Amino acid sequence: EAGEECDCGTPGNPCCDAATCKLRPGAQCAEGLCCDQCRFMKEGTVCRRARGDDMDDYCNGISAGCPRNPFHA
C-alpha cells in the first residue's frame, strides 16, 4: 500500500522507515516481504523460500508486496 502504511503501518515490517512516507530519496518501500533496506527486492528474488510444504514466491522487483506465484502460491 504505502498509503496510510507509508512509514510502516505496523512495526512488523522489514524497513519500517518514515522516509518512505516522505519524499526522501533512497527509500522506496517500508512494507512488504519484497522490501529490503527500504528498497524493492530485485525480480527473481524470493519473498518466500520453499521447503517442501511451501512454494517459492518471487518478487516483481518493483513491488514491495510479495506477488502471488501464478504456479500455485
DSSP 24-65: -TT---SSSTTEETTEEPPTT-EEE---SSS--EE--SS-SS
Residue 56 near residue 48 (C-beta atoms within 8 A) = yes
> Residue 42, by phi and psi: left (phi above 0), alpha (psi -120 to 50) or beta?
beta
C-alpha angle 39-44-50 in degrees, rounded to nearest 5: 105
Radius of gyration (C-alpha) of the chain in whole angstroms: 13
Give 12's contacts (C-beta < 8 A, 6+ positions apart). none
Kindly report the CATH class assigned to 1-66.
few secondary structures
Way the structure was solved: NMR
Residue carrying the nine cell digits 500455485: 72
Closest CA relative to residue 14, chosen from 25, 28, 56: 28
